[PDB]
Curated annotation (Swiss-Prot), chains A, D:
Heterohexamer of one A chain and of five B chains. The biological activity of the toxin is produced by the A chain, which activates intracellular adenyl cyclase. GO terms for cellular component: extracellular region; host cell membrane. It comes from the Bacteria. The chain holds residues 24 to 122 of 122 of the full protein. Disulfide bonds join C12-C83. Keywords: Disulfide bond, Enterotoxin, Signal, Toxin, Virulence. The keyword Glycoprotein does not apply. One of its GO terms (molecular function) is toxin activity. This is Heat-labile enterotoxin IIB, B chain.
């Protein structure tokens, strides 16, 4: 139906992060070079994001699911909604929503 | 619909049974106040996925996550045992139904 | 149906061979009375997947779960070695069959 | 790859294991019964192999990938090439190559 | 082609960019001389996938393995940042391109 769930929006708006709706991810990147170490995605229009990571339970779970959502979007063409931080370049994903429809 | 087995299992607890749910969104959030894994149905119902750190529930909760994603990716229906006290309601058990099975 | 190897392995045990099974439900449940992973076949039969915390059976039981979901998602048939000592019967071994690979 | 990559063949041929090429895996088996405890694969010809396992890094990674390769071959009917030891029965897979058709 | 982000990241290292690679083979090997994970391209190129025991690179290396498999399985193409200091060349970064998203 397009558009993040109201739940997802409400959650994002109570933070400093920015809602990004209806993104098509077309690249998934793994990098271990010491300066650019991380997991990233790139959208059809060139937007770049870094995926959050955590070693500890329970965020080690959510961040692993963020990766699975990112890769499934890339393989499937499914769109995502993102709650993303403007602190850095690239912006960091703090929440992500995979949509069958909206 | 849900297997009798899954219905009976839910009925032993304080939770309620939700049947034939079509999940359309799968959310991962690490924001400090909404930290969790969540799903949203085609009608806007929201649920949190149980989590657990230690054996053996770490297995069961991982499988709930896999079931939820599969549901969203394929449009397969699920049946849920969910606590009504919490909002969003917590999934205590979940049943994935194969495409073209019973409902 | 079942490889001769799988059959022969099952026949070495007190367990029962179940051949040609279409799994149509996959259940994850963390309620404490019915804690576990289960599958339901198109005939309505219910089985519990084995679990193990330690190496190496933690590998095999992980793989049983992957076989179970793969079967539910795809309609591929499984053969099971299941113990009738409890209900639901516990899967001690499982074999996933490629589509159009015999019976 | 109308066959195993020259790399995979060269690597196998320096060991005591033997090369099995172009195999169609039709069954994937998980077993925790006391004397047949293991992961196995069965080919369209009735050949049975045991997948290696390892508890420690780095071979926990390689054996985990062996299992992914084996299931993916069974689901997809993509063929595999195996480097397998005859020191046991079933023969133990020491290396495996998933190959796209062609 | 690779994203500009990916290219700029590769240009700050000693490695070289390889663009638009079709991976046709995925190898897991525990033989004592050639122990590793490798991929092979449609042209016969061989690369070794990086690995790492500990956080955070155990995440990134696990994802390289997932990207590799998904490429071979589905024929989606990859861009790679590969060091020529070893033989086979080692992958230090990899970019998975969506089907129908062009070069």
């Amino acid at each position: 139906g397009s558009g993040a769930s109201q739940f997802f929006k409400d959650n994002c708006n109570r933070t400093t992060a920015s809602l990004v709706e209806g993104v098509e991810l077309t690249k998934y990147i793994s990098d271990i070079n010491n300066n650019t170490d991380g997991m990233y995605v790139v959208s059809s229009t060139g937007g770049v994001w870094r995926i959050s990571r955590a070693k500890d339970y329970p965020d080690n779970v959510m961040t692993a699911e963020m990766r699975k959502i990112a890769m499934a979007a890339v393989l499937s063409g499914m769109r995502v909604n993102m709650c993303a931080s403007p602190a850095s370049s690239p912006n960091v994903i703090w929440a992500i929503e995979l949509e069958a429809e909206g």
